[PDB]
Amino acid sequence: QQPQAKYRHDYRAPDYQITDIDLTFDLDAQKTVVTAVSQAVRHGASDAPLRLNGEDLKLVSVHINDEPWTAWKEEEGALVISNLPERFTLKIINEISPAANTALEGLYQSGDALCTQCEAEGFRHITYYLDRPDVLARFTTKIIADKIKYPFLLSNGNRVAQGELENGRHWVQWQDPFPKPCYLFALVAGDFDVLRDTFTTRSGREVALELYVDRGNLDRAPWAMTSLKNSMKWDEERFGLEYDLDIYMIVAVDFFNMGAMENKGLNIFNSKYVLARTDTATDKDYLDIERVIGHEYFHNWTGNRVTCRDWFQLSLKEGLTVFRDQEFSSDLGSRAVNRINNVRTMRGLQFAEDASPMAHPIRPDMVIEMNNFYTLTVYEKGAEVIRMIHTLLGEENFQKGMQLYFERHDGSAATCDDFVQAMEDASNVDLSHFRRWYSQSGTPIVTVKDDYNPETEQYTLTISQRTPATPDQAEKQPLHIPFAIELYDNEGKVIPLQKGGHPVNSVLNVTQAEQTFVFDNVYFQPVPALLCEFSAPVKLEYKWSDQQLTFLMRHARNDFSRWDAAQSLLATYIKLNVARHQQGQPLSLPVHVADAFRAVLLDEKIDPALAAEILTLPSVNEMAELFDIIDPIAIAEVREALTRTLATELADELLAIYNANYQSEYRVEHEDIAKRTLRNACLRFLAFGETHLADVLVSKQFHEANNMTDALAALSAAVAAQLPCRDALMQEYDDKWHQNGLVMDKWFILQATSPAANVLETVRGLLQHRSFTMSNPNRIRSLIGAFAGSNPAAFHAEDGSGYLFLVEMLTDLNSRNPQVASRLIEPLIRLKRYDAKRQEKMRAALEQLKGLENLSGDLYEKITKALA
Numbered sequence: 001q002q003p004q005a006k007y008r009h010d011y012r013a014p015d016y017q018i019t020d021i022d023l024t025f026d027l028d029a030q031k032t033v034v035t036a037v038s039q040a041v042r043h044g045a046s047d048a049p050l051r052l053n054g055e056d057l058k059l060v061s062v063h064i065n066d067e068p069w070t071a072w073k074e075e076e077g078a079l080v081i082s083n084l085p086e087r088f089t090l091k092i093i094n095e096i097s098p099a100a101n102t103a104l105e106g107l108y109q110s111g112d113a114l115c116t117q118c119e120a121e122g123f124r125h126i127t128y129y130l131d132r133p134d135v136l137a138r139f140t141t142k143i144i145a146d147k148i149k150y151p152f153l154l155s156n157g158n159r160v161a162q163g164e165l166e167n168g169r170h171w172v173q174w175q176d177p178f179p180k181p182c183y184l185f186a187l188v189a190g191d192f193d194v195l196r197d198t199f200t201t202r203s204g205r206e207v208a209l210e211l212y213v214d215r216g217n218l219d220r221a222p223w224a225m226t227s228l229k230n231s232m233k234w235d236e237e238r239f240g241l242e243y244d245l246d247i248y249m250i251v252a253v254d255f256f257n258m259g260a261m262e263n264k265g266l267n268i269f270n271s272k273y274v275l276a277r278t279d280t281a282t283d284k285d286y287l288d289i290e291r292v293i294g295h296e297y298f299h300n301w302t303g304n305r306v307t308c309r310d311w312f313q314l315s316l317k318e319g320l321t322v323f324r325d326q327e328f329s330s331d332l333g334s335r336a337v338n339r340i341n342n343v344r345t346m347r348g349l350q351f352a353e354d355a356s357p358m359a360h361p362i363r364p365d366m367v368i369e370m371n372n373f374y375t376l377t378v379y380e381k382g383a384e385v386i387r388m389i390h391t392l393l394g395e396e397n398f399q400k401g402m403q404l405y406f407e408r409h410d411g412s413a414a415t416c417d418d419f420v421q422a423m424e425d426a427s428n429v430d431l432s433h434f435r436r437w438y439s440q441s442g443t444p445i446v447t448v449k450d451d452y453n454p455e456t457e458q459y460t461l462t463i464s465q466r467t468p469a470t471p472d473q474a475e476k477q478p479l480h481i482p483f484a485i486e487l488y489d490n491e492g493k494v495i496p497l498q499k500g501g502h503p504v505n506s507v508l509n510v511t512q513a514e515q516t517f518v519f520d521n522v523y524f525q526p527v528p529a530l531l532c533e534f535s536a537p538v539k540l541e542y543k544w545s546d547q548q549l550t551f552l553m554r555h556a557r558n559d560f561s562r563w564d565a566a567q568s569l570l571a572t573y574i575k576l577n578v579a580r581h582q583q584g585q586p587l588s589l590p591v592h593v594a595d596a597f598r599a600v601l602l603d604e605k606i607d608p609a610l611a612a613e614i615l616t617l618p619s620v621n622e623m624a625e626l627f628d629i630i631d632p633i634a635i636a637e638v639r640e641a642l643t644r645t646l647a648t649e650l651a652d653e654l655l656a657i658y659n660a661n662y663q664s665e666y667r668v669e670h671e672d673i674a675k676r677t678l679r680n681a682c683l684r685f686l687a688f689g690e691t692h693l694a695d696v697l698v699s700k701q702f703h704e705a706n707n708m709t710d711a712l713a714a715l716s717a718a719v720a721a722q723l724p725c726r727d728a729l730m731q732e733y734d735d736k737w738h739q740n741g742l743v744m745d746k747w748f749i750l751q752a753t754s755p756a757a758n759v760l761e762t763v764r765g766l767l768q769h770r771s772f773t774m775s776n777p778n779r780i781r782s783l784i785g786a787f788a789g790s791n792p793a794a795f796h797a798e799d800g801s802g803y804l805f806l807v808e809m810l811t812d813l814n815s816r817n818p819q820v821a822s823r824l825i826e827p828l829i830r831l832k833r834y835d836a837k838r839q840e841k842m843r844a845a846l847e848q849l850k851g852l853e854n855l856s857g858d859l860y861e862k863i864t865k866a867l868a
């Protein structure tokens with residue numbers, strides 16, 4: 001009964017297009033009546049039927065040119081209409097029930113509001129349609145509703161008509177002139193406060209900006225409004241792109257599965273990426289609002305004006321729009337901190353996916369449930385692939401490629417290959433080999449050996465690559481890997497790269513399984529910086545000495561290299577001490593390693609933004625990727641022991657830097673954020689100082705904080721170090737904040753990731769907490785998702801209790817909200833990375849889920865791959 005996989009190689013142009021669609025919604029939460037009048041054109045064979053997609057629709061009538069049609073049949077997921085003219089008007093009336101829509105796909109209820117989510121395939125839950133993104137139609141949308149309950153009736157585009165009716169109903173009609181695929185349709189109905197502002201484009205177009213929030217939330221909206229203006233200005237400055245309509249609407253909703261959504265002129269956002277005030281939102285929340293606002297804005301060109309031919313091309317818009325949001329954040333804020341954190345995500349989360357049963361190329365070849373492919377790979381590795389193009393081309397060529405891409409493909413539904421060809425043609429850089437990045441899954445491993453010849457003053461790098469087979473692909477081939485280097489002399493000075501009397505570009509083209517690169521006029525032995533700015537998404541194998549790495553921490557020119565060298569230095573001793581833990585032996589760390597971090601604390605010339613990241617230890621998920629078999633208990637306990645050892649060895653310096661970075665004024669400004677990140681990085685270690693000194697310092701910060709960044713940092717430390725004040729602070733936060741779901745998400749995450757022995761009992765009990773509900777995806781992800789994904793030590797408890805808990809939760813969510821269920825099953829899919837006893841219990845859990853009545857396709861796809 002489960003759906004069959006679809007394949008990229010089966011793409012065929014549609015037999016029918018729809019050029020124009022006129023929608024009427026007679027809105028109600030229990031029953032909504034949809035009337036859809038579509039102007040259709042046959043492109044395929046004259047005997048081909050029109051095959052419309054539809055899910056959970058009550059069909060009322062079918063007309064062709066106003067003739068009630070008899071030549072049709074409903075089948076699973078479809079309405080098949082036969083014997084049609086070449087051009088005709090299709091009219092469908094059908095009913096849907098928003099209040100019954102717990103999957104939050106299609107038209108559904110968010111509190112008292114009605115709203116939509118149509119990407120990927122949600123529009124077919126609203127009416128029978130060609131729900132495929134290469135069908136581009138001009139939408140007009142009339143919305144009829146109770147005026148008191150739904151005073152604001154919004155859809156894409158501009159208001160073209162409005163009226164009032166008997167019995168307290170009213171209506172508004174919207175027209176969006178840009179042809180669109182139906183995944184970009186949106187409708188919102190409700191009562192809102194509205195923040196209104198203006199942006200004037202550089203050529204003088206005045207754009208009305210409207211942010212819709214629940215009543216009472218206006219004073220939480222200005223930062224999101226500011227961020228929207230900042231996004232608009234940056235896309236003009238950096239990409240030369242202006243907004244193309246008259247209004248820009250954003251609606252914040254509390255119940256939302258997919259983060260935020262770029263519906264043309266009517267974006268719909270999870271409230272978490274809109275609402276901010278300094279007592280409730282952290283610096284990270286502010287910068288996440290900025291990047292998500294930006295992301296959705298940037299889709300207006302990379303996604304909307306040029307869309308996707310088919311869903312296997314998702315990375316065409318997502319890799320590129322992620323690249324754009326990273327460049328936006330990096331330009332406005334700290335580029336080094338942005339790059340560092342994106343590399344942490346790549347190495348600590350995406351690499352894990354690319355070795356897992358769900359591994360796929362950034363352009364997938366095979367999909368059962370497309371909502372399963374909104375992945376770290378498609379997004380984050382997708383962006384790394386765009387960034388490699390940028391590295392190979394340089395900014396000027398890259399922008400020429402963007403310009404050619406839009407010139408060729410504006411107003412169409414294009415492919416990844418189209419984008420690469422625009423870059424290649426505009427730049428004259430050959431990207432034929434490079435295209436293999438779109439079709440090959442898995443993480444390449446780049447191995448480097450070096451040799452310095454003092455007789456000839458030559459330095460030689462011998463560089464090899466391989467990609468291990470993945471479950472989806474038995475054949476792997478070498479990639480075009482841009483491999484950036486820098487060479488340092490004994491004084492930390494950069495050595496010019498040259499060969500044979502000519503300069504050599506610092507981006508080496510590693511295109512073979514093995515190759516050598518020779519550099520001459522290297523007068524003294526160098527220290528290399530390798531894979532600079534993480535220039536390709538690969539694992540690097542080079543036999544660093546500790547000295548080389550601490551040298552780079554002191555001398556490397558790019559801040560990213562200094563951080564990356566610290567990561568390599570730590571990796572050795574993380575691996576050492578995990579092996580020790582497994583044999584019952586305590587942490588061992590050479591003095592000279594602690595001294596490298598001491599020097600970072602005491603170096604006045606280092607940007608505090610960088611120092612903070614160097615002093616932020618790899619997460620347990622980053623640590624896991626260092627190991628062939630993951631021991632999650634050893635990893636967690638070593639991370640804590642390492643924290644404690646550094647806290648003890650660096651106690652005086654940590655406290656001095658903590659105090660020196662105190663700020664009495666709170667500002668959401670990048671220099672202030674950096675000082676705070678450094679202060680709070682020190683706090684994490686100071687929390688493991690002598691128990692009473694730590695307790696006082698942490699509780700004081702919590703109670704004196706004039707912003708949520710500092711309050712949450714203290715609370716997190718009390719939980720992490722199990723300090724005496726923990727229970728009191730956690731109860732104070734609950735009593736203060738329990739009516740604020742976004743704020744309580746932070747508290748649920750702390751509960752779920754607690755090191756306490758009784759964490760699972762506490763998490764289970766919190767299913768009954770006043771601020772928790774299974775009806776809200778944010779609450780689910782903050783409590784259950786954080787437990788399973790961010791507390792692998794407790795999730796992987798050797799008694800199997802974490803797996804049984806997740807099975808209970810997934811048994812509910814499989815029926816309630818399969819998209820959220822599929823995000824939450826991911827930790828179980830990784831079972832082959834664990835020891836045999838854990839694998840057996842995880843398989844038993846997955847086999848239980850496999851046997852569920854009414855197993856969703858979302859879970860079926862992942863379970864099948866995991867149990868293979």
Ligand SMILES: [NH3+][C@H]1CCc2c(Br)ccc(-c3ccccc3)c2CC1(O)O
Binds near residue numbers: 292295374
């Ligand atoms: N097209 C939508 C799909 C929904 C979606 C998912 Br699912 C996962 C991550 C993001 C996202 C990624 C980065 C920034 C902001 C948001 C999005 C938003 C989107 O891509 O605009």
Ligand SMILES: [Cl-]
Binds near residue numbers: 028029030031
């Ligand atoms: Cl109703």
Ligand SMILES: [Cl-]
Binds near residue numbers: 213217252253254271
């Ligand atoms: Cl809201």
Ligand code: NA
Binds near residue numbers: 329331332
């Ligand atoms: Na910057």
Ligand code: NA
Binds near residue numbers: 121369370857
């Ligand atoms: Na599907």
Ligand code: NA
Binds near residue numbers: 426427428
């Ligand atoms: Na060129």
Ligand code: NA
Binds near residue numbers: 449450451
């Ligand atoms: Na060597």
Ligand code: NA
Binds near residue numbers: 505506507
């Ligand atoms: Na260079």
Ligand code: NA
Binds near residue numbers: 767769770771772773
């Ligand atoms: Na509750």
Ligand SMILES: [Zn+2]
Binds near residue numbers: 299317321
């Ligand atoms: Zn996106």
